[PDB]
């Protein structure tokens, strides 16, 4: 609410009289806003607790690295293959 | 009533058409039967729970059921009997 006062010509201005409120409206477009952050502890603290579907219940396995081979995506951006053949002759 | 699910149940004969054994370990969430009832093929007789998944236990055939080995809540292995029916 608050912040969208802030926002407002009106309050910026000086202009505003007490009736500046009741004279408006869109002081209530507030729209609930998520936190994302919040959820994720969520679904996290959920699975922990109760396991997922068809998952063996067990502590989470140690798994191995397989640290994961990249190309540089410029490098990417300069090969032609069979998209950039479509493209040209359909 | 100091154990509820630490009763064993002996083990499905896997010759006899009548046992019915658990396909894998889990939980019954609902005897839907008793011993003395009579079924059709395909009835509802129980509901277990896997791994969060319901799984519905069925008449094989139809007929009567003899024995039941759970209730409410028991665990179960794979192999368990769990209903006999004629």
Redesign the interface.
Same mark, same amino acid.
């Given at each position: 609410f608050l912040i969208n006062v802030m926002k407002n010509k009106k309050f910026t201005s000086g202009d505003y009289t007490t009736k500046f409120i009741e004279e408006t409206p869109e002081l209530f477009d507030i729209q609930p806003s998520l936190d994302r952050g919040t959820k994720t502890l969520e679904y996290i603290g959920n699975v922990t607790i %109760?396991?997922?579907? %068809?998952?063996?219940?067990r502590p989470k396995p140690d798994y191995e690295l397989a640290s994961i081979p990249t190309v540089s995506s410029s490098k990417i951006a300069s090969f032609s293959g069979t998209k950039q053949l479509l493209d040209e002759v359909g | 009533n100091v154990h509820t699910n630490a009763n064993v149940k002996p083990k499905a004969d896997k010759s006899n058409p009548s046992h019915i054994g658990a396909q894998m370990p889990g939980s019954v969430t609902e005897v839907k039967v008793s011993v003395g009832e009579t079924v059709k093929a395909n009835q509802p007789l129980l509901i277990t729970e896997? +791994?969060? +998944?319901e799984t519905t236990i069925q008449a094989p055939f139809d007929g009567v059921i003899k024995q039941v080995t759970v209730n409410n809540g028991d665990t179960i292995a794979t192999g368990d009997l769990l209903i006999e029916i004629e």
């Open positions: %109760n396991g997922f579907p %068809n998952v063996e219940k | 896997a +791994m969060k +998944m």
